[PDB]
CSV table of N, CA and C and ligand atoms in Angstrom, one decimal:
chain,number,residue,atom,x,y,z
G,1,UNK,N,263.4,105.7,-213.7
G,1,UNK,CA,262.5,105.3,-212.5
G,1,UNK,C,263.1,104.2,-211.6
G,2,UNK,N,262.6,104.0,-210.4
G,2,UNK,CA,262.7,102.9,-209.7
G,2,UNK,C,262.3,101.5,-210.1
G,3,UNK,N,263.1,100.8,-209.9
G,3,UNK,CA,262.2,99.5,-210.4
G,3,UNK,C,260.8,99.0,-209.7
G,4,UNK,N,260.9,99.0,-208.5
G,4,UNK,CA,259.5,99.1,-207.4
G,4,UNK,C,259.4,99.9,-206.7
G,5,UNK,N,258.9,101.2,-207.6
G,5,UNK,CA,258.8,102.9,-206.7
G,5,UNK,C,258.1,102.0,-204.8
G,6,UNK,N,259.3,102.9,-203.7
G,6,UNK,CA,259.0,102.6,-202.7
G,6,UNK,C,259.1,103.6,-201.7
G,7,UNK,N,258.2,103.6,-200.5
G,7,UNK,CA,258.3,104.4,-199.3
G,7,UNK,C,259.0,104.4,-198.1
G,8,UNK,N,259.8,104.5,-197.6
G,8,UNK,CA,260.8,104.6,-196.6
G,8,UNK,C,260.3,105.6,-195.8
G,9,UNK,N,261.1,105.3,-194.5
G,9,UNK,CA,261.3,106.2,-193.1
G,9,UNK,C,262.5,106.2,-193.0
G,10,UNK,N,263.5,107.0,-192.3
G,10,UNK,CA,265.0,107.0,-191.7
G,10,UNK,C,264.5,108.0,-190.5
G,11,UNK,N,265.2,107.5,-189.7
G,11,UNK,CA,265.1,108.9,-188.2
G,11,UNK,C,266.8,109.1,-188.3
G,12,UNK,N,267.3,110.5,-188.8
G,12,UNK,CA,268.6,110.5,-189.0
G,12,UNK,C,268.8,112.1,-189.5
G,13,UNK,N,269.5,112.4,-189.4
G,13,UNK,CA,269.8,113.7,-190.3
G,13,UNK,C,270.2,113.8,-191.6
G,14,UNK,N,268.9,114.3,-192.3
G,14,UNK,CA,269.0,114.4,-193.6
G,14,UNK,C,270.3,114.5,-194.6
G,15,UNK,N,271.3,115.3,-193.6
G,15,UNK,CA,272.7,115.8,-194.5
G,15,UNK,C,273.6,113.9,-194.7
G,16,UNK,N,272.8,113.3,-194.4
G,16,UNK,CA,273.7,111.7,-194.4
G,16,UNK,C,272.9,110.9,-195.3
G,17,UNK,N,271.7,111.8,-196.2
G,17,UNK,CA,271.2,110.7,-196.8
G,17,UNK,C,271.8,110.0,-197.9
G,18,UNK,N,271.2,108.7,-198.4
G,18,UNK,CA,272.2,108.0,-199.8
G,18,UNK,C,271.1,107.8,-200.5
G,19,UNK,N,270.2,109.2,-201.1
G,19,UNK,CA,269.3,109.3,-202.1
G,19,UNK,C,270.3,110.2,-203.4
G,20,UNK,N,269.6,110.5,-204.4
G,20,UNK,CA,270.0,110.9,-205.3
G,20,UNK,C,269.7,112.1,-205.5
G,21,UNK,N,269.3,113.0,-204.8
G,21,UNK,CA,268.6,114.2,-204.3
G,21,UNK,C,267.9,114.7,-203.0
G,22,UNK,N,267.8,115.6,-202.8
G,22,UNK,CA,267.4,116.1,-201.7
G,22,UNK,C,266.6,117.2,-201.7
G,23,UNK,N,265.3,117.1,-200.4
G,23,UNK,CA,264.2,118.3,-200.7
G,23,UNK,C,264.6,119.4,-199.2
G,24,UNK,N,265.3,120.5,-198.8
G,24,UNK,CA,265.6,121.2,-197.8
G,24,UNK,C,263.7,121.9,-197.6
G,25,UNK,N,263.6,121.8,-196.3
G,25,UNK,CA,262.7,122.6,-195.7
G,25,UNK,C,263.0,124.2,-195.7
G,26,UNK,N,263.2,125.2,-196.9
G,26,UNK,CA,263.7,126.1,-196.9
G,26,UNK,C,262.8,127.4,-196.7
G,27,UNK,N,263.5,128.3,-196.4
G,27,UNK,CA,262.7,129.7,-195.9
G,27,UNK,C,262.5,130.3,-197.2
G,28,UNK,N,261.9,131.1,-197.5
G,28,UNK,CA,261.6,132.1,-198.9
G,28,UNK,C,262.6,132.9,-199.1
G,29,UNK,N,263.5,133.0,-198.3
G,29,UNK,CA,264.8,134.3,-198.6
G,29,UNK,C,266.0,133.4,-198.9
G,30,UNK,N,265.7,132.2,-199.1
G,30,UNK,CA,267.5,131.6,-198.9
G,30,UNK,C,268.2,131.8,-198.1
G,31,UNK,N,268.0,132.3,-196.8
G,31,UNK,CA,269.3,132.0,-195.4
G,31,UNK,C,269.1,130.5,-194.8
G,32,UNK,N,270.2,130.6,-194.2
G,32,UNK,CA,270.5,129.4,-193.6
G,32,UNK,C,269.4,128.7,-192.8
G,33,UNK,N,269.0,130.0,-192.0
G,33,UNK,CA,267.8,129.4,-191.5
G,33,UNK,C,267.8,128.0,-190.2
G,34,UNK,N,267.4,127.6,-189.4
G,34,UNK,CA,267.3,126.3,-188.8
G,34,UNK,C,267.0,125.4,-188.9
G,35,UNK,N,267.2,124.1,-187.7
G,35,UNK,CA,267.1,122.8,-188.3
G,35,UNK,C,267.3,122.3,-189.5
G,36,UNK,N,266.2,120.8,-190.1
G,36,UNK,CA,266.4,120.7,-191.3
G,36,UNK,C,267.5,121.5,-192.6
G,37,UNK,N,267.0,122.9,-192.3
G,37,UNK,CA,267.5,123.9,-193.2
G,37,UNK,C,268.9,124.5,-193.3
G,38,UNK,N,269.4,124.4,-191.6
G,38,UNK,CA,270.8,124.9,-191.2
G,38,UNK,C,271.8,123.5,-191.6
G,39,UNK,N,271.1,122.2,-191.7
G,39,UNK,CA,272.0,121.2,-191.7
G,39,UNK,C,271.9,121.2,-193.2
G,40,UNK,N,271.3,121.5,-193.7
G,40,UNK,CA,271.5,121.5,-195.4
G,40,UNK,C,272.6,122.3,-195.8
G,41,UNK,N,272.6,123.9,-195.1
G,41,UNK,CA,273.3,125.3,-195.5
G,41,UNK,C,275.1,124.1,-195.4
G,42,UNK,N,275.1,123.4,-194.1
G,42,UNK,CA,276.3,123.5,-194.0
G,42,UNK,C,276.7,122.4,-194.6
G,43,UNK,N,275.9,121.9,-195.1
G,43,UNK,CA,276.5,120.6,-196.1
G,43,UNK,C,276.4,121.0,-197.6
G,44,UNK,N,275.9,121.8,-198.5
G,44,UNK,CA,275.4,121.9,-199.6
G,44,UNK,C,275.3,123.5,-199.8
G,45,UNK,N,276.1,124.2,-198.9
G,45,UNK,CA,276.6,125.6,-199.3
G,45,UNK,C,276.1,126.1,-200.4
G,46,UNK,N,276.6,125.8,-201.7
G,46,UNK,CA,276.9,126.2,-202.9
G,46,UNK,C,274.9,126.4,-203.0
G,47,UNK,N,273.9,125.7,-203.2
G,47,UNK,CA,273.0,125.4,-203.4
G,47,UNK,C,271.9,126.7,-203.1
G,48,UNK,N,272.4,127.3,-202.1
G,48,UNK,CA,271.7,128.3,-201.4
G,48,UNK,C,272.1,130.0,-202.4
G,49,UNK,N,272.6,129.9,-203.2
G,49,UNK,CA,272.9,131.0,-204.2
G,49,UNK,C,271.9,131.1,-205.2
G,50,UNK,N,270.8,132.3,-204.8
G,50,UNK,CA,269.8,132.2,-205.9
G,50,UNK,C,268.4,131.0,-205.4
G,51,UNK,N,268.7,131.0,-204.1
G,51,UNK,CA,267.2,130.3,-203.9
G,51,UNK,C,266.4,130.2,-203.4
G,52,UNK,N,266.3,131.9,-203.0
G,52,UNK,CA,265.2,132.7,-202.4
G,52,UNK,C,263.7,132.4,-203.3
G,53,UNK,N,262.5,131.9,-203.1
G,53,UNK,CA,261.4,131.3,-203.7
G,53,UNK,C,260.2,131.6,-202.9
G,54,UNK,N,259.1,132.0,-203.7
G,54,UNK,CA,257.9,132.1,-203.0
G,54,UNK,C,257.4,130.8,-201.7
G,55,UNK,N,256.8,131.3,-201.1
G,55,UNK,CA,255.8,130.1,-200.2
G,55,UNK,C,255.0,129.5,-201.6
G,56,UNK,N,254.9,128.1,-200.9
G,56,UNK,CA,254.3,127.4,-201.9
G,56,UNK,C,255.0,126.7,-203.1
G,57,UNK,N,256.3,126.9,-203.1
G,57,UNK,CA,257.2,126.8,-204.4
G,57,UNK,C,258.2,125.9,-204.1
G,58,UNK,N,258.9,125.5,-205.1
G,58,UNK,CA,260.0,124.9,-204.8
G,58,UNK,C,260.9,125.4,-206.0
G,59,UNK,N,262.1,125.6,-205.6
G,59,UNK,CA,263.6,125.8,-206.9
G,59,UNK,C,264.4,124.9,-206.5
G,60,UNK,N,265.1,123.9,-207.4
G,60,UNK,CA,266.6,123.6,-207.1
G,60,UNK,C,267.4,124.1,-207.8
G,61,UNK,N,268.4,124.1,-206.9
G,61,UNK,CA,270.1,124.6,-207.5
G,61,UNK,C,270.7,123.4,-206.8
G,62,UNK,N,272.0,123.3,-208.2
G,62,UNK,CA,272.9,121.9,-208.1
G,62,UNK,C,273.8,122.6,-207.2
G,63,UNK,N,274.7,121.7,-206.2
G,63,UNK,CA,275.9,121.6,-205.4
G,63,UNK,C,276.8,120.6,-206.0
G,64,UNK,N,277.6,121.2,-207.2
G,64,UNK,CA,278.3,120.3,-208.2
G,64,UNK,C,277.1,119.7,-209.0
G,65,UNK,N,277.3,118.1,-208.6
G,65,UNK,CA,275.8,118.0,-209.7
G,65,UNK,C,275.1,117.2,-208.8
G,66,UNK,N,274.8,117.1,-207.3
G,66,UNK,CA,273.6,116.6,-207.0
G,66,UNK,C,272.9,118.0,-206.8
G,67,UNK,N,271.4,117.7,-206.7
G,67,UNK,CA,270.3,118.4,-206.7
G,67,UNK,C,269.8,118.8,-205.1
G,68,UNK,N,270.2,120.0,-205.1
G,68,UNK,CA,268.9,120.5,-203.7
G,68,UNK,C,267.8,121.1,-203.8
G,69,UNK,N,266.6,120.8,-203.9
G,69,UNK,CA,265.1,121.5,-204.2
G,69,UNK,C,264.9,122.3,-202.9
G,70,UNK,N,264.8,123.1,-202.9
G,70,UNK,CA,264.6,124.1,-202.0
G,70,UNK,C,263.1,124.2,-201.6
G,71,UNK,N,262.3,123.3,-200.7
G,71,UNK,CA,260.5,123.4,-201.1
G,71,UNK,C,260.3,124.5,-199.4
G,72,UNK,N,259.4,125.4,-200.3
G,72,UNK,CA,258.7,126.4,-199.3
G,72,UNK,C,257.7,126.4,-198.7
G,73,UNK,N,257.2,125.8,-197.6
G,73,UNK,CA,256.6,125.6,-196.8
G,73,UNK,C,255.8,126.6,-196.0
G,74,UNK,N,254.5,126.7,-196.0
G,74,UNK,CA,253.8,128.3,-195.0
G,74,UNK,C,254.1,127.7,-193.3
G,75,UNK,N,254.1,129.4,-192.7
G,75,UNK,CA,254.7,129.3,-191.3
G,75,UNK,C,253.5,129.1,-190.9
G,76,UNK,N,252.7,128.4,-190.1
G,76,UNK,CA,251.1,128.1,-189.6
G,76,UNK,C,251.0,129.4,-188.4
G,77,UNK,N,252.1,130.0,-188.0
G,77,UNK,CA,252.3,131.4,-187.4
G,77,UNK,C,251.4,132.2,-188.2
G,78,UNK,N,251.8,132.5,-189.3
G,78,UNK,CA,251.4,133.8,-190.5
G,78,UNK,C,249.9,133.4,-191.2
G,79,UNK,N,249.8,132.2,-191.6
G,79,UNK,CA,248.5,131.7,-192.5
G,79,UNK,C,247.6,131.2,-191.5
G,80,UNK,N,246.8,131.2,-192.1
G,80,UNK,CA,244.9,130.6,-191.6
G,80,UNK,C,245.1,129.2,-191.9
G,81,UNK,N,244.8,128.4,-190.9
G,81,UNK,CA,244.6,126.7,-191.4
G,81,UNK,C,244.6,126.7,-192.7
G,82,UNK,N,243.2,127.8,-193.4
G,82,UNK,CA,243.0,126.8,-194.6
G,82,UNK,C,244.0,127.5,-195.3
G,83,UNK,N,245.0,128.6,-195.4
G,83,UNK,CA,245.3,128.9,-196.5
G,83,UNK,C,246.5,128.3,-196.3
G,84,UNK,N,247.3,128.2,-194.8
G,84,UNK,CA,248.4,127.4,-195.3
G,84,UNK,C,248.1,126.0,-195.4
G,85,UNK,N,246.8,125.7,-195.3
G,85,UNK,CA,247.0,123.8,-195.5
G,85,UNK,C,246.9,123.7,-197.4
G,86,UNK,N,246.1,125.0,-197.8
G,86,UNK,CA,246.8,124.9,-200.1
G,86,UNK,C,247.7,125.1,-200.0
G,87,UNK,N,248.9,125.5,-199.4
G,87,UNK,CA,250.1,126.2,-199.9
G,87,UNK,C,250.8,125.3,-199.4
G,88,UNK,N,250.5,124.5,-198.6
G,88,UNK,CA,251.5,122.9,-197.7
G,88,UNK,C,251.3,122.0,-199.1
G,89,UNK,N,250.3,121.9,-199.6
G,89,UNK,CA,249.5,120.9,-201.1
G,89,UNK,C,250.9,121.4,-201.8
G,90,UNK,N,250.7,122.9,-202.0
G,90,UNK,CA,251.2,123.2,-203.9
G,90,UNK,C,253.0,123.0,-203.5
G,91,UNK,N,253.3,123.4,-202.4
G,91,UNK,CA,254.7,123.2,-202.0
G,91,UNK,C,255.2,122.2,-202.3
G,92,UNK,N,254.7,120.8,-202.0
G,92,UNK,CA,254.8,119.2,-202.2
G,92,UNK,C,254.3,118.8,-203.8
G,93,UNK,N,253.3,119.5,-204.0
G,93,UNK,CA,253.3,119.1,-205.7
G,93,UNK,C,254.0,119.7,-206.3
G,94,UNK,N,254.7,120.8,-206.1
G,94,UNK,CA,255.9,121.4,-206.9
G,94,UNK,C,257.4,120.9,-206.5
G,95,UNK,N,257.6,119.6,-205.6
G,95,UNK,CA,258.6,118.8,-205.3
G,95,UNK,C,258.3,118.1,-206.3
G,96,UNK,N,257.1,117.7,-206.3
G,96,UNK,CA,257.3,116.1,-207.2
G,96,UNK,C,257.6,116.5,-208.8
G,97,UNK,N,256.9,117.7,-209.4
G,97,UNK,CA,257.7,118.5,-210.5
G,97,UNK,C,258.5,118.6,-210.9
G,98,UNK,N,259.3,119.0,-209.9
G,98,UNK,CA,261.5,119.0,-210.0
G,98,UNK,C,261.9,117.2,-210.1
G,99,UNK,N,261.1,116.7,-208.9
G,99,UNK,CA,262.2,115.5,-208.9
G,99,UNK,C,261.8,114.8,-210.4
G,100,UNK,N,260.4,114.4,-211.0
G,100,UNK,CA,260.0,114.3,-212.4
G,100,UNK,C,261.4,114.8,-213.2
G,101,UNK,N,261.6,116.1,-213.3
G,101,UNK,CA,262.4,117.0,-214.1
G,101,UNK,C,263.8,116.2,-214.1
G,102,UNK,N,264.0,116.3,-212.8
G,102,UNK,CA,265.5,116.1,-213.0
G,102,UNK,C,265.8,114.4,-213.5
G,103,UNK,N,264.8,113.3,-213.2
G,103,UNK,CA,265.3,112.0,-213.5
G,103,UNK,C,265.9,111.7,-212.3
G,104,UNK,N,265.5,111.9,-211.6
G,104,UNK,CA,266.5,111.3,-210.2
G,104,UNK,C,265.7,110.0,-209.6
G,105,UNK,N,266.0,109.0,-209.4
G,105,UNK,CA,265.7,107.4,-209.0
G,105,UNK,C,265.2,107.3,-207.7
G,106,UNK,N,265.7,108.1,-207.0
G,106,UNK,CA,265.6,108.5,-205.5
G,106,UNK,C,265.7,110.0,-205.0
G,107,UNK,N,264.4,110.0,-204.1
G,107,UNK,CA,264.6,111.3,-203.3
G,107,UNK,C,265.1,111.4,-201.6
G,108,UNK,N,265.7,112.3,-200.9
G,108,UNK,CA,265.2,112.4,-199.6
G,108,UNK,C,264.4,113.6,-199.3
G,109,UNK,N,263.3,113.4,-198.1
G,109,UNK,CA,262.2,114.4,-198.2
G,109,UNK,C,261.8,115.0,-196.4
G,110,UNK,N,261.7,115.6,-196.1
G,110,UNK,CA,261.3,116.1,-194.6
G,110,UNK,C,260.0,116.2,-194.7
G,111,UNK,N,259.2,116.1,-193.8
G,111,UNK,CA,258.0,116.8,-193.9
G,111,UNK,C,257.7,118.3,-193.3
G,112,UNK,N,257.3,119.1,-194.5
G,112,UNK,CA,257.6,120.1,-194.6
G,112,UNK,C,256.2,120.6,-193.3
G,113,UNK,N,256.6,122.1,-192.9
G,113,UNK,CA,255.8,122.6,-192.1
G,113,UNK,C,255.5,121.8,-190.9
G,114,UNK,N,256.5,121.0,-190.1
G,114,UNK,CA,256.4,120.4,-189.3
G,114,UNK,C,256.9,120.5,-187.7
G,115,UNK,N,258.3,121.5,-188.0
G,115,UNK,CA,258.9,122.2,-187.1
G,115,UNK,C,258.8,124.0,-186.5
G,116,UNK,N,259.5,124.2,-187.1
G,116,UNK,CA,259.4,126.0,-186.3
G,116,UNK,C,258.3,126.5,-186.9
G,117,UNK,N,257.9,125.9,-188.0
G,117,UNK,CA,256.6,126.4,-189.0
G,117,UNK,C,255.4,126.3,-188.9
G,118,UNK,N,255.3,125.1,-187.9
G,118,UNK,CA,253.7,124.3,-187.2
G,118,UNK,C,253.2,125.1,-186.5
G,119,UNK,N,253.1,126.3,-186.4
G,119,UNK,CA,252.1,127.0,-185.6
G,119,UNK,C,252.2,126.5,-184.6
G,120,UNK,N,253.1,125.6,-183.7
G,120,UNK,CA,253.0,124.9,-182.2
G,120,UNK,C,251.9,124.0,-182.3
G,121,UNK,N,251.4,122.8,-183.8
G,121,UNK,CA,250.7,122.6,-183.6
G,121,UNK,C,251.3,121.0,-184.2
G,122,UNK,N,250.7,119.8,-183.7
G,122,UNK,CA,251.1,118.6,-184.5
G,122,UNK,C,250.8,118.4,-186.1
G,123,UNK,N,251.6,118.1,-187.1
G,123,UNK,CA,251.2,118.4,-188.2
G,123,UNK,C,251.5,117.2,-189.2
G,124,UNK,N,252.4,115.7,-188.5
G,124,UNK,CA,252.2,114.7,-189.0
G,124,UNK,C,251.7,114.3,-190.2
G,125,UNK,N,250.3,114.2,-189.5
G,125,UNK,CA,249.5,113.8,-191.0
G,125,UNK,C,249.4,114.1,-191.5
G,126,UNK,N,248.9,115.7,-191.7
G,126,UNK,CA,248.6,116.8,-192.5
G,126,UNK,C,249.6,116.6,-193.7
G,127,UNK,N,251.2,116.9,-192.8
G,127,UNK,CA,252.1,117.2,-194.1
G,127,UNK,C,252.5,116.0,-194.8
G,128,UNK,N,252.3,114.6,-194.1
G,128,UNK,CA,252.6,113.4,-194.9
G,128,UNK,C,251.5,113.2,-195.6
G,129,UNK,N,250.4,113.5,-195.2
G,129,UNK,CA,249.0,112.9,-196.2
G,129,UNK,C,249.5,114.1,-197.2
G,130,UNK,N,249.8,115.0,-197.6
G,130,UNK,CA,250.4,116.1,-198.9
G,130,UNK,C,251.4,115.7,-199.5
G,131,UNK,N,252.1,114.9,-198.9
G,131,UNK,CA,253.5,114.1,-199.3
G,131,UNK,C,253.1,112.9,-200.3
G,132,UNK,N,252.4,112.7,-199.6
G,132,UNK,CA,252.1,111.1,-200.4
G,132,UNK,C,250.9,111.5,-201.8
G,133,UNK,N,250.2,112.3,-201.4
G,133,UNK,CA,249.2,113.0,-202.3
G,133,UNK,C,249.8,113.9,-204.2
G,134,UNK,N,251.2,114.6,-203.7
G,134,UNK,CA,252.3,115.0,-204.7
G,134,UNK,C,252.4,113.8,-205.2
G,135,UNK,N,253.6,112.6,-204.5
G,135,UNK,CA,254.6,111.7,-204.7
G,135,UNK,C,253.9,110.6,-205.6
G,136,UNK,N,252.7,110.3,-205.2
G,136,UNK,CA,252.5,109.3,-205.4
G,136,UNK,C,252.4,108.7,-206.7
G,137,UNK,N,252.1,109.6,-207.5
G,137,UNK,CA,252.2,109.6,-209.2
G,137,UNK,C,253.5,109.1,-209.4
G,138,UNK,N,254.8,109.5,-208.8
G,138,UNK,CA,256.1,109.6,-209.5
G,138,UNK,C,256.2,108.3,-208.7
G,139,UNK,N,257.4,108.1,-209.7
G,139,UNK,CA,258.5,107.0,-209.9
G,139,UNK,C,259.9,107.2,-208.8
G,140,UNK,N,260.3,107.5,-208.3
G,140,UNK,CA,261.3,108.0,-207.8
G,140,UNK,C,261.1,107.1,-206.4
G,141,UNK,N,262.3,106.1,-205.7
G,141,UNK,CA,262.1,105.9,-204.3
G,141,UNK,C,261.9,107.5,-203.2
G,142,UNK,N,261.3,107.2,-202.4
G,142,UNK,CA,260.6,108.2,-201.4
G,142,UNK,C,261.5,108.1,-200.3
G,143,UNK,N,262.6,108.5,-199.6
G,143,UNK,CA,263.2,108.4,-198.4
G,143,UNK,C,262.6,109.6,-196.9
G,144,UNK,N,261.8,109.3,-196.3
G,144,UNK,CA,261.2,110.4,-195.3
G,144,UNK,C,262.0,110.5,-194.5
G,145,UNK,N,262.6,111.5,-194.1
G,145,UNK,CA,263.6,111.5,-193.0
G,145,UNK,C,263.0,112.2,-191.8
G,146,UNK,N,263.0,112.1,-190.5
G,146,UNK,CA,262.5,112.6,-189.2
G,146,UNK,C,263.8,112.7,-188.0
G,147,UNK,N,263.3,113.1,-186.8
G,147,UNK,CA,264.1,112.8,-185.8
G,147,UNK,C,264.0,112.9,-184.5
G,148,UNK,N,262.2,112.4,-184.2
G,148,UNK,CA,261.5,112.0,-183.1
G,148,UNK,C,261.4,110.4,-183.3
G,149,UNK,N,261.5,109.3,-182.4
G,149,UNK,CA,261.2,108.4,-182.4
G,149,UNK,C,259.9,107.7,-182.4
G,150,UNK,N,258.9,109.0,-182.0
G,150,UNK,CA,257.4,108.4,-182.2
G,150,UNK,C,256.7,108.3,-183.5
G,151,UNK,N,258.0,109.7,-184.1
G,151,UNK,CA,257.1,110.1,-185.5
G,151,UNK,C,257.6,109.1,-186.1
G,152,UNK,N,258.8,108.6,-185.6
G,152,UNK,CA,259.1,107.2,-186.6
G,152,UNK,C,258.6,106.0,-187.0
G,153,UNK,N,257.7,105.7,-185.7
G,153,UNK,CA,256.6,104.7,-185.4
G,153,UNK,C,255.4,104.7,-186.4
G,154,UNK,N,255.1,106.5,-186.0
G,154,UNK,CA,253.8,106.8,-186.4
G,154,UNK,C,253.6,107.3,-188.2
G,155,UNK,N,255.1,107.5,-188.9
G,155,UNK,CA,255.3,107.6,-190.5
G,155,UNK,C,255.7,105.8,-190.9
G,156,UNK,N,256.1,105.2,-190.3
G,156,UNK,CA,256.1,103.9,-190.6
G,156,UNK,C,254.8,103.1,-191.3
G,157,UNK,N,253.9,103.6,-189.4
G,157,UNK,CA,252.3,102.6,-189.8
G,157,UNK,C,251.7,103.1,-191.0
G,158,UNK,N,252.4,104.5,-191.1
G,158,UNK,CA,251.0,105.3,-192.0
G,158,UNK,C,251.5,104.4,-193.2
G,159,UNK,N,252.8,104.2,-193.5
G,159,UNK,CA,253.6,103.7,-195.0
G,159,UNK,C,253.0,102.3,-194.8
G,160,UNK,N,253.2,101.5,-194.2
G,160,UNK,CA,252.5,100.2,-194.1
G,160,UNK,C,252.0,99.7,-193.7
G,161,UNK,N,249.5,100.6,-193.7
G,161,UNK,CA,248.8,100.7,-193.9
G,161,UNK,C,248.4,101.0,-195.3
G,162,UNK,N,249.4,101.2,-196.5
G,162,UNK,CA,248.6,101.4,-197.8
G,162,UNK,C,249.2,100.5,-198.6
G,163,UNK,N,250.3,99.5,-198.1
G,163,UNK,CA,251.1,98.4,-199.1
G,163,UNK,C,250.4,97.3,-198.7
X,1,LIG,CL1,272.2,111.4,-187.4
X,2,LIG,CL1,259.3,123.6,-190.4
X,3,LIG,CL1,260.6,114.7,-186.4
C-alpha cells in the first residue's frame, strides 16, 4: 500500500505517467482505437493481445511486467443514462479489483466515458464521482490524468473538497 493513500490530477498524456500501472480507456474488441486508447496501443503494444472485454469490465495484460488494465467503459451513444451510468460504476469497481490484485502502490487512471464515449455530453462528475466511489476503499496512490485545462481546475477542487 501507499503510505498516505493519495489523490492527484496531472493534465499530460497518460503514456508519460511515473505510476506503477496504468488503467487504458479501452474499446471491447481490443483495437487501437483513439485518444487515451491510441496513445496506450503505441506505447504498450504487447498489452493489447487478448484484451478484447465486455462493457463494464476490466482485463489486464502485462507489457513485460508493468500492468495495463484495459477498463471498458459504455458509449452514452448506445446506452440509456441509466444503463450506462451502472456499467460506468461496475467498469471503475472492476479497476479497483485488478489494481487490489496486482499490489501495485500506484495507479494512473483517465476518466472513463468522457471522450468519444460521452454521448456529446459533459461527464466530469459522473465519471470521477465513480472513480472515487471504486478507489476509495483501496490503498494504491490515485494519479487522474486529463488534458483540458478547466477539467484540471475542476478535478483538482473536486480532490481538495474531501481532504
Ligand atoms: Cl504531454
Ligand atoms: Cl471515452
Ligand atoms: Cl480532459
Amino acid at each position: 500500500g501507499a503510505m498516505a493513500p493519495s489523490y492527484r490530477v496531472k493534465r499530460m498524456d497518460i503514456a508519460k505517467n511515473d505510476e506503477e500501472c496504468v488503467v487504458n480507456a479501452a474499446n471491447p474488441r481490443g483495437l487501437p482505437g483513439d485518444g487515451v486508447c491510441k496513445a496506450v496501443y503505441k506505447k504498450w503494444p504487447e498489452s493489447f493481445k487478448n484484451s478484447a472485454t465486455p462493457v463494464g469490465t476490466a482485463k489486464t495484460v502485462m507489457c513485460g511486467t508493468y500492468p495495463v488494465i484495459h477498463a471498458v467503459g459504455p458509449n452514452f451513444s448506445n446506452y440509456t443514462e441509466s444503463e450506462g451510468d451502472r456499467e460506468l460504476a461496475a467498469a471503475y469497481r472492476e479497476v479497483a479489483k485488478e489494481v487490489t490484485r496486482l499490489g501495485v502502490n500506484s495507479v494512473a487512471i483517465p476518466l472513463l466515458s468522457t471522450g468519444v464515449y460521452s454521448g456529446g455530453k459533459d461527464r466530469l462528475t459522473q465519471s470521477l464521482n465513480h472513480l472515487f466511489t471504486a478507489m476509495d476503499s483501496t490503498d494504491a496512490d490515485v494519479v487522474i490524468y486529463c488534458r483540458d485545462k478547466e477539467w484540471e481546475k475542476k478535478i483538482s477542487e473536486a480532490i481538495q473538497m474531501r481532504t
